Protein backbone atom coordinates (compact mmCIF):
# COMPACT_ATOMS: atom_id res chain seq x y z
CA UNK A 1 0.00 0.00 0.00
CA UNK A 2 2.44 2.68 1.20
CA UNK A 3 6.25 2.38 1.20
CA UNK A 4 8.07 3.55 4.34
CA UNK A 5 10.92 5.94 3.51
CA UNK A 6 14.30 5.42 5.21
CA UNK A 7 12.87 2.81 7.60
CA UNK A 8 14.61 -0.34 8.85
CA UNK A 9 12.52 -3.02 10.59
CA UNK A 10 13.41 -6.38 12.13
CA UNK A 11 11.49 -9.42 10.91
CA UNK A 12 11.45 -12.97 12.26
CA UNK A 13 9.39 -15.44 10.24
CA UNK A 14 10.02 -18.15 12.86
CA UNK A 15 8.43 -16.12 15.66
CA UNK A 16 5.40 -14.57 13.98
CA UNK A 17 1.98 -14.43 15.66
CA UNK A 18 0.35 -14.18 12.22
CA UNK A 19 1.49 -17.77 11.63
CA UNK A 20 -0.07 -18.90 14.92
CA UNK A 21 -3.27 -17.04 14.10
CA UNK A 22 -3.53 -18.62 10.67
CA UNK A 23 -2.87 -22.06 12.18
CA UNK A 24 -5.79 -21.75 14.59
CA UNK A 25 -7.95 -20.43 11.74
CA UNK A 26 -7.24 -23.41 9.49
CA UNK A 27 -7.84 -25.87 12.32
CA UNK A 28 -11.25 -24.23 12.87
CA UNK A 29 -12.03 -24.29 9.15
CA UNK A 30 -11.27 -28.03 8.97
CA UNK A 31 -13.52 -28.79 11.98
CA UNK A 32 -16.61 -27.34 10.30
CA UNK A 33 -15.64 -28.56 6.84
CA UNK A 34 -13.87 -31.93 6.37
CA UNK A 35 -15.62 -33.97 9.08
CA UNK A 36 -14.48 -37.58 9.61
CA UNK A 37 -16.81 -40.51 10.37
CA UNK A 38 -14.75 -41.28 13.46
CA UNK A 39 -12.08 -39.28 15.27
CA UNK A 40 -9.80 -40.60 18.00
CA UNK A 41 -7.69 -38.47 20.31
CA UNK A 42 -5.63 -39.78 23.21
CA UNK A 43 -6.16 -38.70 26.81
CA UNK A 44 -3.52 -39.95 29.25
CA UNK A 45 -3.46 -36.97 31.62
CA UNK A 46 -4.46 -39.24 34.51
CA UNK A 47 -2.05 -41.33 36.56
CA UNK A 48 -3.26 -44.81 35.58
CA UNK A 49 -5.25 -45.96 32.55
CA UNK A 50 -5.70 -43.83 29.43
CA UNK A 51 -9.05 -42.70 28.05
CA UNK A 52 -9.11 -42.35 24.28
CA UNK A 53 -11.74 -39.83 23.20
CA UNK A 54 -13.89 -41.30 20.42
CA UNK A 55 -16.27 -39.20 18.34
CA UNK A 56 -18.60 -40.76 15.78
CA UNK A 57 -20.54 -38.45 13.46
CA UNK A 58 -22.15 -38.16 10.03
CA UNK A 59 -19.44 -37.71 7.40
CA UNK A 60 -20.83 -36.35 4.10
CA UNK A 61 -18.76 -36.66 0.94
CA UNK A 62 -17.84 -33.08 0.11
CA UNK A 63 -15.57 -31.37 -2.39
CA UNK A 64 -12.81 -29.43 -0.66
CA UNK A 65 -11.28 -26.47 -2.51
CA UNK A 66 -9.06 -24.02 -0.58
CA UNK A 67 -10.09 -20.39 -1.03
CA UNK A 68 -7.72 -17.42 -0.58
CA UNK A 69 -7.59 -15.79 2.86
CA UNK A 70 -6.55 -12.17 3.32
CA UNK A 71 -5.28 -11.17 6.74
CA UNK A 72 -5.89 -7.52 7.46
CA UNK A 73 -4.72 -5.69 10.58
CA UNK A 74 -6.31 -6.84 13.84
CA UNK A 75 -7.64 -4.08 16.12
CA UNK A 76 -4.79 -1.96 17.53
CA UNK A 77 -2.15 -3.19 15.09
CA UNK A 78 -0.64 -2.60 11.64
CA UNK A 79 0.80 -4.99 9.06
CA UNK A 80 4.33 -4.30 7.85
CA UNK A 81 5.66 -5.95 4.72
CA UNK A 82 9.27 -6.71 3.80
CA UNK A 83 9.86 -6.04 0.09
CA UNK A 84 13.36 -7.52 -0.32
CA UNK A 85 13.37 -10.51 -2.68
CA UNK A 86 16.44 -12.03 -1.01
CA UNK A 87 15.19 -11.53 2.57
CA UNK A 88 16.39 -14.57 4.53
CA UNK A 89 13.49 -14.58 7.01
CA UNK A 90 15.23 -13.23 10.10
CA UNK A 91 16.84 -9.81 10.43
CA UNK A 92 16.66 -6.19 9.26
CA UNK A 93 14.59 -5.35 6.19
CA UNK A 94 15.54 -1.98 4.69
CA UNK A 95 12.69 -1.92 2.16
CA UNK A 96 9.51 -2.03 4.21
CA UNK A 97 5.94 -0.91 3.57
CA UNK A 98 2.65 -0.87 5.44
CA UNK A 99 -0.22 -2.79 3.86
CA UNK A 100 -3.95 -2.96 4.63
CA UNK A 101 -4.01 -6.72 4.19
CA UNK A 102 -1.77 -9.60 3.14
CA UNK A 103 -2.02 -11.03 -0.38
CA UNK A 104 -4.51 -13.88 -0.87
CA UNK A 105 -3.21 -17.05 0.77
CA UNK A 106 -4.65 -20.49 0.01
CA UNK A 107 -4.44 -22.58 3.20
CA UNK A 108 -3.17 -25.74 1.48
CA UNK A 109 -2.52 -28.56 3.93
CA UNK A 110 0.21 -30.80 2.57
CA UNK A 111 3.54 -32.40 3.31
CA UNK A 112 6.83 -32.31 1.35
CA UNK A 113 5.75 -30.07 -1.53
CA UNK A 114 4.15 -26.66 -1.06
CA UNK A 115 1.35 -26.20 -3.59
CA UNK A 116 -0.51 -23.25 -5.10
CA UNK A 117 1.61 -20.77 -3.14
CA UNK A 118 3.54 -17.64 -4.09
CA UNK A 119 6.77 -17.79 -6.09
CA UNK A 120 10.00 -16.02 -5.21
CA UNK A 121 10.20 -12.82 -7.28
CA UNK A 122 13.84 -13.29 -8.24
CA UNK A 123 15.98 -16.35 -7.52
CA UNK A 124 15.10 -19.52 -5.61
CA UNK A 125 15.30 -18.82 -1.88
CA UNK A 126 15.98 -21.22 0.98
CA UNK A 127 15.19 -20.39 4.59
CA UNK A 128 15.78 -22.02 7.97
CA UNK A 129 15.72 -20.87 11.58
CA UNK A 130 19.20 -22.45 11.88
CA UNK A 131 20.85 -24.05 8.84
CA UNK A 132 23.54 -25.66 11.02
CA UNK A 133 20.83 -27.56 12.91
CA UNK A 134 19.94 -30.69 10.91
CA UNK A 135 16.63 -31.10 12.77
CA UNK A 136 15.29 -27.72 11.60
CA UNK A 137 13.18 -27.59 8.45
CA UNK A 138 14.45 -25.90 5.31
CA UNK A 139 11.75 -23.95 3.50
CA UNK A 140 12.40 -23.70 -0.22
CA UNK A 141 10.72 -20.99 -2.29
CA UNK A 142 10.80 -21.62 -6.04
CA UNK A 143 10.82 -18.80 -8.58
CA UNK A 144 9.21 -21.01 -11.22
CA UNK A 145 6.29 -23.32 -10.50
CA UNK A 146 6.17 -26.99 -11.54
CA UNK A 147 2.85 -28.66 -12.42
CA UNK A 148 1.88 -31.82 -10.58
CA UNK A 149 -1.23 -33.57 -11.95
CA UNK A 150 -2.89 -36.18 -9.77
CA UNK A 151 -5.71 -38.67 -10.31
CA UNK A 152 -7.77 -40.83 -7.97
CA UNK A 153 -6.75 -43.63 -10.33
CA UNK A 154 -3.61 -43.82 -8.20
CA UNK A 155 -0.84 -41.59 -9.55
CA UNK A 156 0.60 -38.07 -9.94
CA UNK A 157 2.48 -36.80 -13.00
CA UNK A 158 5.38 -34.29 -13.06
CA UNK A 159 7.43 -33.22 -16.10
CA UNK A 160 10.89 -34.71 -15.58
CA UNK A 161 12.74 -31.93 -17.41
CA UNK A 162 10.99 -29.27 -15.31
CA UNK A 163 11.70 -31.10 -12.05
CA UNK A 164 15.31 -31.67 -13.07
CA UNK A 165 15.83 -27.94 -13.61
CA UNK A 166 14.14 -27.24 -10.26
CA UNK A 167 16.44 -29.60 -8.34
CA UNK A 168 19.48 -28.04 -10.04
CA UNK A 169 18.35 -24.59 -8.90
CA UNK A 170 17.70 -25.84 -5.36
CA UNK A 171 21.00 -27.69 -5.12
CA UNK A 172 22.84 -24.56 -6.31
CA UNK A 173 21.24 -22.61 -3.44
CA UNK A 174 21.96 -25.37 -0.92
CA UNK A 175 25.64 -25.32 -1.99
CA UNK A 176 25.65 -21.55 -1.56
CA UNK A 177 24.60 -22.24 2.05
CA UNK A 178 26.57 -25.38 2.99
CA UNK A 179 29.64 -25.14 0.73
CA UNK A 180 30.42 -24.77 -2.96
CA UNK A 181 32.64 -27.86 -2.82
CA UNK A 182 29.84 -30.07 -1.49
CA UNK A 183 27.94 -32.68 -3.45
CA UNK A 184 24.20 -32.18 -3.05
CA UNK A 185 22.17 -35.37 -2.76
CA UNK A 186 18.42 -35.80 -2.62
CA UNK A 187 17.00 -38.96 -1.02
CA UNK A 188 13.56 -40.26 -0.06
CA UNK A 189 12.05 -39.60 3.37
CA UNK A 190 13.87 -41.65 6.01
CA UNK A 191 10.64 -42.64 7.76
CA UNK A 192 7.88 -41.74 10.20
CA UNK A 193 4.12 -41.36 9.70
CA UNK A 194 2.62 -42.06 6.24
CA UNK A 195 1.57 -38.39 5.99
CA UNK A 196 5.18 -37.14 6.06
CA UNK A 197 6.91 -40.09 4.39
CA UNK A 198 4.83 -39.52 1.26
CA UNK A 199 3.73 -36.34 -0.46
CA UNK A 200 0.40 -35.97 1.33
CA UNK A 201 -2.38 -33.66 0.24
CA UNK A 202 -6.10 -33.59 -0.35
CA UNK A 203 -7.81 -33.52 -3.75
CA UNK A 204 -11.55 -33.66 -4.42
CA UNK A 205 -12.01 -34.09 -0.66
CA UNK A 206 -9.85 -37.23 -0.66
CA UNK A 207 -6.52 -37.78 1.09
CA UNK A 208 -3.69 -38.75 -1.27
CA UNK A 209 -0.44 -40.41 -0.24
CA UNK A 210 2.05 -40.15 -3.10
CA UNK A 211 5.38 -41.96 -3.07
CA UNK A 212 7.94 -39.22 -3.81
CA UNK A 213 11.06 -41.38 -4.06
CA UNK A 214 11.37 -40.60 -7.79
CA UNK A 215 11.44 -36.86 -7.04
CA UNK A 216 14.19 -37.21 -4.45
CA UNK A 217 16.73 -39.60 -5.87
CA UNK A 218 19.58 -37.63 -7.43
CA UNK A 219 23.15 -36.45 -6.94
CA UNK A 220 24.19 -32.92 -7.90
CA UNK A 221 27.52 -31.19 -8.60
CA UNK A 222 29.44 -34.45 -8.30
CA UNK A 223 31.31 -35.77 -11.35
CA UNK A 224 30.64 -33.76 -14.52
CA UNK A 225 14.98 -40.74 -18.75
CA UNK A 226 11.20 -40.75 -19.17
CA UNK A 227 9.64 -37.40 -20.14
CA UNK A 228 7.19 -37.83 -17.26
CA UNK A 229 7.80 -38.78 -13.64
CA UNK A 230 4.83 -40.87 -12.53
CA UNK A 231 4.43 -41.16 -8.75
CA UNK A 232 2.30 -44.02 -7.45
CA UNK A 233 -0.37 -42.78 -5.04
CA UNK A 234 -2.93 -44.22 -2.65
CA UNK A 235 -6.12 -42.63 -1.44
CA UNK A 236 -6.57 -43.56 2.21
CA UNK A 237 -9.45 -43.52 4.71
CA UNK A 238 -7.61 -43.73 8.05
CA UNK A 239 -5.58 -40.57 8.47
CA UNK A 240 -3.29 -39.21 11.17
CA UNK A 241 -4.59 -35.78 12.21
CA UNK A 242 -2.42 -32.76 11.41
CA UNK A 243 -4.31 -30.46 13.82
CA UNK A 244 -3.36 -32.43 16.92
CA UNK A 245 -2.32 -35.94 17.92
CA UNK A 246 -5.06 -38.34 16.88
CA UNK A 247 -6.57 -40.33 14.04
CA UNK A 248 -9.58 -39.73 11.80
CA UNK A 249 -11.50 -42.11 9.56
CA UNK A 250 -13.23 -40.99 6.38
CA UNK A 251 -15.62 -42.85 4.09
CA UNK A 252 -14.30 -44.29 0.78
CA UNK A 253 -14.44 -42.21 -2.44
CA UNK A 254 -17.67 -41.90 -4.41
CA UNK A 255 -16.22 -40.19 -7.49
CA UNK A 256 -14.64 -42.18 -10.33
CA UNK A 257 -13.02 -39.09 -11.80
CA UNK A 258 -10.89 -37.37 -9.20
CA UNK A 259 -8.46 -35.06 -11.01
CA UNK A 260 -6.24 -32.32 -9.61
CA UNK A 261 -3.56 -30.08 -11.00
CA UNK A 262 -1.47 -27.98 -8.65
CA UNK A 263 1.61 -25.85 -9.03
CA UNK A 264 4.56 -26.79 -6.86
CA UNK A 265 5.80 -23.41 -5.62
CA UNK A 266 8.01 -24.56 -2.74
CA UNK A 267 9.39 -27.52 -0.77
CA UNK A 268 10.00 -28.50 2.82
CA UNK A 269 13.33 -30.27 3.21
CA UNK A 270 15.45 -31.61 6.03
CA UNK A 271 19.19 -32.13 5.90
CA UNK A 272 20.64 -35.38 7.24
CA UNK A 273 23.78 -33.84 8.69
CA UNK A 274 25.57 -35.82 11.38
CA UNK A 275 29.33 -35.93 12.00
CA UNK A 276 31.15 -36.62 8.74
CA UNK A 277 34.36 -35.52 7.01
CA UNK A 278 32.52 -36.05 3.72
CA UNK A 279 32.06 -33.15 1.29
CA UNK A 280 28.42 -34.06 0.61
CA UNK A 281 25.01 -33.12 2.04
CA UNK A 282 21.86 -35.26 1.99
CA UNK A 283 18.42 -33.65 1.80
CA UNK A 284 15.07 -35.39 2.19
CA UNK A 285 11.50 -34.16 1.78
CA UNK A 286 9.94 -33.11 5.08
CA UNK A 287 7.06 -31.15 6.54
CA UNK A 288 4.20 -32.16 8.80
CA UNK A 289 4.06 -28.99 10.87
CA UNK A 290 1.58 -26.89 8.89
CA UNK A 291 2.93 -23.75 10.56
CA UNK A 292 5.83 -24.10 8.12
CA UNK A 293 3.25 -24.12 5.32
CA UNK A 294 1.77 -20.84 6.63
CA UNK A 295 5.27 -19.47 7.20
CA UNK A 296 6.16 -20.02 3.54
CA UNK A 297 3.60 -17.32 2.72
CA UNK A 298 3.70 -15.12 5.83
CA UNK A 299 7.50 -14.77 6.18
CA UNK A 300 7.37 -11.26 4.70
CA UNK A 301 4.66 -9.89 6.99
CA UNK A 302 4.76 -8.72 10.56
CA UNK A 303 2.13 -7.20 12.86
CA UNK A 304 3.12 -4.22 15.03
CA UNK A 305 1.39 -2.02 17.63
CA UNK A 306 0.22 1.31 16.22
Amino acid sequence: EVVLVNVTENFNMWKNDMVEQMHEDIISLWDQSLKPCVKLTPLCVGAGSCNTSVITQACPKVSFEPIPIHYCAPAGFAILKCNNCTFNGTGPCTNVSTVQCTHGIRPVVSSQLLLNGSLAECEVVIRSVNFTDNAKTIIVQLNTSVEINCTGAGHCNIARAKWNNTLKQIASKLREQFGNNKTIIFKQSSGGDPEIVTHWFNCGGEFFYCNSTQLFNSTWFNSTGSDTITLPCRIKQIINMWQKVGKAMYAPPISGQIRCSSNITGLLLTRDGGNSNNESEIFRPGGGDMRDNWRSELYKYKVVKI
Partner: antibody
Amino acid sequence: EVQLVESGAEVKKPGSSVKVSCKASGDTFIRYSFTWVRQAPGQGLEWMGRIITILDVAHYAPHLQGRVTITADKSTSTVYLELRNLRSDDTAVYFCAGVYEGEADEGEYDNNGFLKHWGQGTLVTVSS
Amino acid sequence: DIVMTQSPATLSVSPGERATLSCRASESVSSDLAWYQQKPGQAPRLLIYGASTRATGVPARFSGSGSGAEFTLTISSLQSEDFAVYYCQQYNNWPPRYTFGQGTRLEIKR
Protein backbone atom coordinates in the same frame (compact mmCIF):
# COMPACT_ATOMS: atom_id res chain seq x y z
CA GLU B 1 -10.43 -65.67 4.58
CA VAL B 2 -11.09 -65.84 8.32
CA GLN B 3 -12.56 -68.86 10.15
CA LEU B 4 -14.63 -67.95 13.22
CA VAL B 5 -14.97 -70.38 16.12
CA GLU B 6 -17.15 -69.34 19.04
CA SER B 7 -17.16 -70.36 22.69
CA GLY B 8 -19.60 -72.89 24.13
CA ALA B 9 -23.23 -72.64 25.20
CA GLU B 10 -24.05 -70.50 28.23
CA VAL B 11 -26.86 -70.79 30.76
CA LYS B 12 -27.60 -67.76 32.92
CA LYS B 13 -30.10 -66.49 35.47
CA PRO B 14 -31.87 -63.23 34.63
CA GLY B 15 -29.82 -60.34 36.05
CA SER B 16 -26.51 -62.06 35.31
CA SER B 17 -23.90 -61.05 32.75
CA VAL B 18 -22.42 -63.19 30.00
CA LYS B 19 -19.27 -62.93 27.91
CA VAL B 20 -18.99 -64.98 24.75
CA SER B 21 -15.95 -65.17 22.52
CA CYS B 22 -15.06 -65.71 18.91
CA LYS B 23 -11.61 -66.80 17.77
CA ALA B 24 -10.73 -65.56 14.26
CA SER B 25 -8.15 -67.61 12.34
CA GLY B 26 -6.70 -67.65 8.84
CA ASP B 27 -6.15 -64.03 7.80
CA THR B 28 -4.92 -60.71 9.21
CA PHE B 29 -7.14 -59.90 12.21
CA ILE B 30 -6.91 -56.07 11.99
CA ARG B 31 -7.99 -56.06 8.33
CA TYR B 32 -11.41 -57.29 9.47
CA SER B 33 -14.34 -55.75 11.27
CA PHE B 34 -16.50 -57.97 13.46
CA THR B 35 -20.20 -57.88 14.19
CA TRP B 36 -22.43 -59.71 16.64
CA VAL B 37 -25.87 -60.80 15.47
CA ARG B 38 -28.35 -62.73 17.60
CA GLN B 39 -31.39 -64.85 16.87
CA ALA B 40 -34.05 -65.72 19.42
CA PRO B 41 -35.75 -69.13 18.96
CA GLY B 42 -38.20 -68.89 16.04
CA GLN B 43 -37.27 -65.28 15.31
CA GLY B 44 -35.11 -63.29 12.88
CA LEU B 45 -31.61 -61.87 12.94
CA GLU B 46 -30.92 -58.88 15.20
CA TRP B 47 -27.81 -56.75 14.65
CA MET B 48 -26.21 -56.01 18.01
CA GLY B 49 -23.12 -54.02 17.12
CA ARG B 50 -19.87 -53.94 15.21
CA ILE B 51 -16.25 -53.28 16.10
CA ILE B 52 -13.76 -51.54 13.82
CA THR B 53 -10.90 -53.74 14.94
CA ILE B 54 -8.02 -51.54 13.75
CA LEU B 55 -9.47 -48.53 15.63
CA ASP B 56 -10.78 -50.43 18.66
CA VAL B 57 -14.07 -48.61 18.14
CA ALA B 58 -17.44 -50.31 18.47
CA HIS B 59 -20.94 -49.13 17.65
CA TYR B 60 -24.09 -50.68 19.08
CA ALA B 61 -27.77 -51.09 18.30
CA PRO B 62 -29.78 -48.42 20.15
CA HIS B 63 -31.99 -50.94 22.00
CA LEU B 64 -28.88 -52.52 23.55
CA GLN B 65 -26.83 -49.37 24.12
CA GLY B 66 -25.50 -49.26 27.68
CA ARG B 67 -25.50 -52.96 28.51
CA VAL B 68 -23.57 -54.43 25.57
CA THR B 69 -19.79 -54.21 25.07
CA ILE B 70 -17.85 -55.56 22.10
CA THR B 71 -14.08 -55.89 22.47
CA ALA B 72 -11.18 -57.36 20.53
CA ASP B 73 -7.90 -58.84 21.70
CA LYS B 74 -5.46 -58.35 18.82
CA SER B 75 -2.87 -60.48 20.62
CA THR B 76 -5.17 -63.52 20.54
CA SER B 77 -7.19 -62.69 17.41
CA THR B 78 -10.28 -63.00 19.62
CA VAL B 79 -13.46 -60.91 19.60
CA TYR B 80 -15.66 -60.63 22.70
CA LEU B 81 -19.31 -59.83 23.33
CA GLU B 82 -20.45 -58.94 26.83
CA LEU B 83 -24.14 -58.54 27.62
CA ARG B 84 -25.02 -57.29 31.11
CA ASN B 85 -28.22 -57.29 33.17
CA LEU B 86 -29.48 -60.27 31.17
CA ARG B 87 -33.20 -60.72 30.63
CA SER B 88 -35.04 -63.92 29.77
CA ASP B 89 -35.69 -62.35 26.35
CA ASP B 90 -31.92 -62.25 25.76
CA THR B 91 -32.23 -66.03 25.19
CA ALA B 92 -30.88 -66.49 21.67
CA VAL B 93 -28.16 -67.92 19.51
CA TYR B 94 -25.37 -65.35 19.33
CA PHE B 95 -23.36 -65.20 16.11
CA CYS B 96 -20.00 -63.57 15.59
CA ALA B 97 -19.49 -62.46 12.00
CA GLY B 98 -16.85 -60.50 10.11
CA VAL B 99 -15.86 -58.96 6.81
CA TYR B 100 -12.60 -57.93 5.18
CA GLU B 101 -12.20 -54.14 5.14
CA GLY B 102 -9.10 -53.75 2.98
CA GLU B 103 -5.48 -53.02 3.87
CA ALA B 104 -6.45 -51.33 7.14
CA ASP B 105 -2.86 -51.36 8.42
CA GLU B 106 -2.08 -49.19 5.39
CA GLY B 107 -5.02 -46.86 6.05
CA GLU B 108 -7.43 -48.43 3.52
CA TYR B 109 -10.87 -49.03 5.00
CA ASP B 110 -14.06 -49.65 3.06
CA ASN B 111 -16.21 -49.79 6.18
CA ASN B 112 -18.23 -52.74 4.91
CA GLY B 113 -21.53 -53.30 6.73
CA PHE B 114 -22.35 -56.71 5.22
CA LEU B 115 -21.15 -59.99 6.74
CA LYS B 116 -19.15 -62.59 4.80
CA HIS B 117 -17.77 -64.88 7.52
CA TRP B 118 -19.84 -66.37 10.33
CA GLY B 119 -19.12 -68.34 13.48
CA GLN B 120 -21.13 -71.44 14.36
CA GLY B 121 -23.20 -69.57 16.96
CA THR B 122 -23.34 -69.76 20.75
CA LEU B 123 -26.62 -70.59 22.49
CA VAL B 124 -27.20 -68.35 25.48
CA THR B 125 -30.14 -69.44 27.59
CA VAL B 126 -31.37 -66.94 30.17
CA SER B 127 -33.89 -68.35 32.62
CA SER B 128 -34.81 -68.70 36.29
CA ASP C 1 -34.74 -46.53 12.75
CA ILE C 2 -34.72 -48.02 9.25
CA VAL C 3 -37.30 -50.79 8.99
CA MET C 4 -36.76 -53.61 6.52
CA THR C 5 -39.86 -55.47 5.35
CA GLN C 6 -39.74 -58.68 3.35
CA SER C 7 -42.48 -60.32 1.31
CA PRO C 8 -43.92 -62.77 1.15
CA ALA C 9 -43.34 -64.24 4.62
CA THR C 10 -43.51 -67.68 3.01
CA LEU C 11 -42.90 -68.46 -0.66
CA SER C 12 -43.80 -71.91 -1.99
CA VAL C 13 -42.06 -72.87 -5.23
CA SER C 14 -41.98 -76.06 -7.31
CA PRO C 15 -38.45 -77.48 -7.69
CA GLY C 16 -36.52 -76.12 -10.68
CA GLU C 17 -38.71 -73.04 -11.09
CA ARG C 18 -37.96 -69.35 -10.53
CA ALA C 19 -38.32 -67.63 -7.16
CA THR C 20 -38.53 -63.88 -6.63
CA LEU C 21 -38.11 -62.44 -3.11
CA SER C 22 -38.86 -58.86 -2.09
CA CYS C 23 -37.31 -56.48 0.43
CA ARG C 24 -38.44 -52.92 1.09
CA ALA C 25 -36.85 -50.23 3.27
CA SER C 26 -38.79 -47.58 5.23
CA GLU C 27 -36.44 -45.04 3.66
CA SER C 28 -33.66 -45.01 1.08
CA VAL C 29 -30.62 -47.17 1.82
CA SER C 30 -29.03 -46.57 -1.60
CA SER C 31 -27.35 -49.83 -2.60
CA ASP C 32 -26.16 -50.77 0.89
CA LEU C 33 -28.26 -53.90 0.91
CA ALA C 34 -27.22 -57.51 1.51
CA TRP C 35 -29.05 -60.86 1.20
CA TYR C 36 -28.39 -63.90 3.38
CA GLN C 37 -29.48 -67.53 3.22
CA GLN C 38 -30.03 -69.52 6.43
CA LYS C 39 -30.86 -73.17 6.91
CA PRO C 40 -32.16 -74.57 10.23
CA GLY C 41 -29.40 -74.98 12.83
CA GLN C 42 -26.84 -73.17 10.69
CA ALA C 43 -25.36 -69.69 10.53
CA PRO C 44 -26.56 -67.32 7.80
CA ARG C 45 -24.68 -67.29 4.51
CA LEU C 46 -23.98 -64.14 2.52
CA LEU C 47 -25.40 -64.28 -1.03
CA ILE C 48 -25.51 -60.69 -2.26
CA TYR C 49 -24.03 -57.41 -1.08
CA GLY C 50 -24.20 -53.89 -2.51
CA ALA C 51 -27.69 -54.80 -3.73
CA SER C 52 -26.46 -56.77 -6.76
CA THR C 53 -22.97 -58.21 -6.19
CA ARG C 54 -22.76 -61.99 -5.72
CA ALA C 55 -20.47 -63.07 -2.88
CA THR C 56 -17.73 -65.61 -3.59
CA GLY C 57 -19.01 -69.19 -3.83
CA VAL C 58 -22.53 -68.04 -4.75
CA PRO C 59 -23.97 -69.67 -7.93
CA ALA C 60 -25.04 -67.47 -10.87
CA ARG C 61 -28.70 -68.46 -10.47
CA PHE C 62 -28.80 -66.07 -7.49
CA SER C 63 -29.35 -62.49 -8.64
CA GLY C 64 -29.96 -59.29 -6.70
CA SER C 65 -31.41 -56.06 -8.05
CA GLY C 66 -32.86 -52.71 -7.00
CA SER C 67 -31.72 -49.56 -5.22
CA GLY C 68 -33.07 -46.90 -2.86
CA ALA C 69 -35.94 -48.55 -1.01
CA GLU C 70 -36.97 -51.50 -3.17
CA PHE C 71 -34.97 -54.68 -3.69
CA THR C 72 -35.42 -58.12 -5.21
CA LEU C 73 -33.61 -61.45 -4.85
CA THR C 74 -34.20 -63.75 -7.83
CA ILE C 75 -33.29 -67.43 -7.94
CA SER C 76 -33.63 -68.50 -11.58
CA SER C 77 -34.01 -72.25 -11.03
CA LEU C 78 -34.48 -73.62 -7.54
CA GLN C 79 -32.24 -76.50 -6.55
CA SER C 80 -32.85 -78.74 -3.55
CA GLU C 81 -30.24 -76.79 -1.56
CA ASP C 82 -31.92 -73.41 -2.23
CA PHE C 83 -34.90 -74.00 0.06
CA ALA C 84 -34.20 -72.03 3.22
CA VAL C 85 -34.97 -68.74 4.95
CA TYR C 86 -33.71 -65.56 3.29
CA TYR C 87 -32.93 -62.27 5.06
CA CYS C 88 -32.15 -58.82 3.72
CA GLN C 89 -29.90 -56.42 5.64
CA GLN C 90 -29.67 -52.64 5.39
CA TYR C 91 -26.25 -51.08 6.19
CA ASN C 92 -26.51 -47.54 4.83
CA ASN C 93 -26.71 -45.42 7.99
CA TRP C 94 -23.95 -43.69 9.97
CA PRO C 95 -23.48 -43.97 12.88
CA PRO C 96 -24.25 -47.62 12.09
CA ARG C 97 -27.64 -48.94 13.14
CA TYR C 98 -27.93 -51.85 10.79
CA THR C 99 -31.22 -53.75 10.55
CA PHE C 100 -32.56 -57.01 9.10
CA GLY C 101 -35.84 -57.84 7.40
CA GLN C 102 -37.91 -60.51 9.18
CA GLY C 103 -37.10 -63.10 6.52
CA THR C 104 -38.88 -64.95 3.75
CA ARG C 105 -39.11 -68.72 4.12
CA LEU C 106 -38.71 -70.44 0.75
CA GLU C 107 -40.31 -73.89 0.89
CA ILE C 108 -41.04 -76.70 -1.56
CA LYS C 109 -44.39 -76.67 -3.31
CA ARG C 110 -45.71 -80.20 -3.76
